[PDB]
Paper text:
The three largest gene segments of the Thogotoviruses, THOV, DHOV and JOSV are homologous to those of IAV and code for the heterotrimeric polymerase. In this paper we present the atomic structures of the putative PB2 [name] binding and 627 domains of THOV and the putative PA N-terminal endonuclease domains of THOV and DHOV. Despite very low sequence homologies, all domains have similar folds to those of the corresponding IAV polymerase domains. However, the critical active site residues in the putative [name] binding and endonuclease domains are not conserved in THOV and DHOV and, contrary to the case of IAV polymerase, neither domain shows the expected in vitro biochemical activity.
Comparison of the two independent molecules in the asymmetric unit of crystal form 1 shows that the region 72–89, including helix α3 and the following loop, is in two very distinct orientations. These are arranged as three asymmetric dimers, each similar to that observed in form 1, but for the chain in which the 72–89 element is dissociated from the body of the protein, the electron density for the element is lacking, presumably due to mobility. Interestingly, the significant difference in thermal stability behaviour of the THOV and DHOV domains correlates with the enhanced plasticity and much poorer diffracting crystals of THOV PA-Nter. For THOV and DHOV PA-Nter the putative active site is more like an extended groove and furthermore, is positively charged. Our structural and biochemical results therefore strongly suggest that THOV and DHOV PA-Nter domains neither bind divalent cations nor are active endonucleases.
Residue numbers in the entry:
A (entry chain F): 2 to 49, 55 to 64, 82 to 166
B (entry chain E): 3 to 50, 53 to 165
Write the structure that this text describes.
């Protein structure tokens, strides 16, 4: 249970007090998964700023917001893409595979530039998972 | 208990939204609200490619409040619109009405999207929605009208409008 290579220094340091990790089941992993999601949020908000990131700012909050088009989004991780019904009418879902693939609604909104970063970021994290065979602890966390 | 033309998820979302058992026509009213909600979903599948509409109906209260702050917009908790067009910065309410002909707006803080039992759209609702969206609505309300006629529920439904 150490900060992985693929996670950013700032991300990990910011994540520490955002949720009380020791108390939870798969607490180190749950932190890492949430760190994937924040990383995704940052990757997406490198358009110009088009997106503001609300996750882990300084209670019922979205993960980012499009300043131009005035739309809120929530980043999700899913195991089955086809089986997906919106969780919210207001915070629109941006769902992805562990492999990196994005859902129909997700690919209509995001630019290739942002997807290719995320798929790059996700396989590198999936590699880290598979290195320590943490597959079921991650798949459970997605339920 | 649910009609097959209503989706399972919509049905289970409606469960807690109002105290149906206490009402006369309570089951029929639940179904009518599901129609309105189902219609909100059928409208919001469009995109500019960012989502065109946000749906407020049957959402958590604190989320409705959060976005209206960001969009510098304000509706009473009693009268909250069903969806919001992110393109035009204008809000709507899905109404079901028997008489479309001489329809008068319900509000001045949002607009009405009025529909028939046959699925026909009110003049002003027709102006707003694309043909793509009306086919889907009228097709859904045909399947809804079938269920109504199959269970001889036509009077109850007309009365509760």
């Amino acid at each position: 249970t150490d900060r992985p290579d693929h996670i950013d220094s700032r991300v990990w340091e910011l994540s520490e007090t955002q949720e009380d990790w020791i108390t939870q089941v798969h607490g180190h992993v749950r932190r890492v998964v949430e760190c994937w999601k924040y990383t995704i949020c940052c990757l997406i908000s490198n358009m110009h700023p088009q997106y503001d990131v609300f996750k882990w700012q300084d209670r019922d909050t979205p993960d980012l917001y499009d300043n131009e088009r005035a739309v809120a989004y929530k980043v999700l991780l899913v195991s089955d893409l086809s089986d997906h019904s919106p969780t919210s009418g207001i915070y629109h879902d941006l769902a992805f595979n562990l492999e990196g693939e994005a859902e129909e609604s997700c690919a209509l909104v995001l630019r290739g530039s942002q997807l290719q970063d995320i798929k790059g970021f996700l396989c590198r994290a999936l590699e880290w998972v598979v290195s320590n065979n943490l597959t079921q602890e991650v798949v459970e966390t997605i339920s």
